[PDB]
Enzyme design. Structure first.
Site, short mmCIF file in Angstrom:
data_model
loop_
_atom_site.label_atom_id
_atom_site.label_comp_id
_atom_site.label_asym_id
_atom_site.label_seq_id
_atom_site.Cartn_x
_atom_site.Cartn_y
_atom_site.Cartn_z
N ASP A 137 12.18 23.74 13.72
CA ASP A 137 12.23 23.00 12.46
C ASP A 137 12.97 21.68 12.60
OD1 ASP A 137 11.51 22.78 9.75
OD2 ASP A 137 13.31 23.84 9.04
N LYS A 139 13.61 17.88 12.39
CA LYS A 139 13.16 16.80 11.50
C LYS A 139 14.42 16.10 11.02
CE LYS A 139 12.97 20.06 7.63
NZ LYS A 139 12.12 20.57 6.51
N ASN A 142 17.17 17.84 9.03
CA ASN A 142 17.96 18.85 9.74
C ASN A 142 18.86 18.28 10.83
OD1 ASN A 142 17.15 20.94 8.15
ND2 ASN A 142 15.47 21.60 9.49
N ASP A 159 20.35 23.99 10.43
CA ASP A 159 19.23 24.79 9.91
C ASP A 159 18.44 25.56 10.97
OD1 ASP A 159 17.38 26.10 8.42
OD2 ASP A 159 16.75 24.35 7.25
N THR A 178 7.57 22.22 8.56
CA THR A 178 7.12 21.12 7.72
C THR A 178 5.94 20.42 8.38
OG1 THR A 178 9.38 20.77 6.92
CG2 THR A 178 7.81 18.97 6.61
O1 KMP Z 1 20.78 20.85 2.17
C1 KMP Z 1 21.21 21.49 3.14
C2 KMP Z 1 22.40 21.14 3.76
O2 KMP Z 1 23.07 20.06 3.25
C3 KMP Z 1 22.91 21.82 4.86
C4 KMP Z 1 24.13 21.63 5.53
C5 KMP Z 1 24.99 20.58 5.26
C6 KMP Z 1 26.20 20.48 5.94
C7 KMP Z 1 26.56 21.45 6.87
O3 KMP Z 1 27.75 21.33 7.51
C8 KMP Z 1 25.72 22.52 7.13
C9 KMP Z 1 24.50 22.61 6.46
O4 KMP Z 1 22.20 22.90 5.31
C10 KMP Z 1 21.05 23.32 4.71
C11 KMP Z 1 20.40 24.46 5.18
C12 KMP Z 1 19.24 24.91 4.57
O5 KMP Z 1 18.61 26.03 5.05
C13 KMP Z 1 18.72 24.23 3.48
C14 KMP Z 1 19.38 23.09 3.01
O6 KMP Z 1 18.90 22.39 1.94
C15 KMP Z 1 20.54 22.61 3.62
CL CL Z 2 22.27 25.34 8.26
#
Ligand code: KMP
Ligand code: CL
Length: 275
Positions: A137, A139, A142, A159, A178
């Site tokens: 995943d 992108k 992420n 993610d 995606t």
């Molecule tokens: O929006 C997301 C997000 O901000 C973050 C994230 C931000 C900061 C971190 O330190 C760790 C994760 O993870 C995600 C994981 C998902 O499966 C779906 C999401 O929408 C987010």
């Molecule tokens: Cl995450």
């Protein structure tokens, strides 16, 4: 595997919401005992086996198992896991500089700026692939920045909700992310391996350099059809001052046959990347 079933609120205080998706919401938090800050990812559990809502325990446990393995500067790390009837709560390393996606929406990058990001992404993926972990995943959404107000922002891959161990060279699972970023083998429901990530890196690189998405159609079915046909080109309006070597790097990633695609090691030795 069972997780900590004490109330997470006994040990952490939550703050700003970082973002949410279909099955998860992520909130900034602070551990009471240390004052240290984390991102708490609340993943909604399935409440019956045949249901389609929430995430199956098998899928949650896989993500947790993968996260527990990893420790590298360019990948998110897992601190703790809690659970209750409704959620599994991953206490994750906090990366507070926002998505690469949002950073890009502000800027097109120079080749230097693109390679500065890309080299970190490649280093993170090299670590993962070395452990036979496919992310599946990758992108810009992420890829999170540690601090976006510096000339060369540092990044971490997040993610791992689709990530798998590839201990047999491939997984045959209907794993599907995606449309804009999935490799043709994903589109075609074929056996999947580490190669799928390298295609995604190609797409990310195209975007970094141009601000344009190479396979994006007006609907998801068009995007997927474009991916399967390798229907992309380097538009002169976007790539006229981009080096031929940068284009070469992308071209050797956006290859339909996974066996002919550059591997992560190939990408690090490619003349556009190699020091
Ligand atoms: O929006 C997301 C997000 O901000 C973050 C994230 C931000 C900061 C971190 O330190 C760790 C994760 O993870 C995600 C994981 C998902 O499966 C779906 C999401 O929408 C987010
Ligand atoms: Cl995450």
């Amino acid at each position: 595997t069972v997780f900590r079933q004490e109330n997470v609120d006994d040990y952490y205080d939550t703050g700003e919401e970082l973002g949410s998706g279909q099955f998860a919401v992520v909130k900034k938090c602070r551990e009471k005992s240390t004052g240290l800050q984390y991102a708490a990812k609340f993943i909604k559990k399935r409440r019956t086996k045949s249901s389609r809502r929430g995430v199956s325990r098998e899928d949650i446990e896989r993500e947790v198992s993968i996260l527990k393995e990893i420790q590298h500067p360019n990948v998110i790390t897992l601190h703790e896991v809690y659970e209750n009837k409704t959620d599994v709560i991953l206490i994750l390393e906090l990366v507070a500089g926002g998505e690469l996606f949002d950073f890009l929406a502000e800027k097109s990058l120079t080749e230097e700026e693109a390679t500065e990001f890309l080299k970190q992404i490649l280093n993170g993926v090299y670590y993962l692939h070395s452990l036979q972990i496919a992310h599946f995943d990758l992108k810009p959404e992420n890829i999170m920045l540690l601090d976006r107000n510096v000339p060369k922002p540092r990044i971490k891959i997040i993610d791992f909700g689709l990530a798998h161990k590839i201990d047999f060279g491939n997984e045959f699972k209907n794993i599907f992310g995606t449309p804009e970023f999935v490799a043709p083998e994903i589109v075609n429901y074929e056996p999947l391996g580490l190669e799928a990530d390298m295609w995604s890196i190609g797409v990310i690189t195209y975007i970094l350099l141009s601000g344009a998405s190479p396979f994006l159609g007006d609907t998801k079915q068009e995007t997927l059809a474009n991916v399967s046909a390798v229907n992309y080109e380097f538009e002169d309006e976007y790539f006229s001052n981009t080096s031929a070597l940068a284009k070469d790097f992308i071209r050797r990633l956006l290859v339909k046959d996974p066996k002919k695609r550059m591997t992560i090691q190939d990408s690090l030795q490619h003349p556009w990347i190699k020091p």
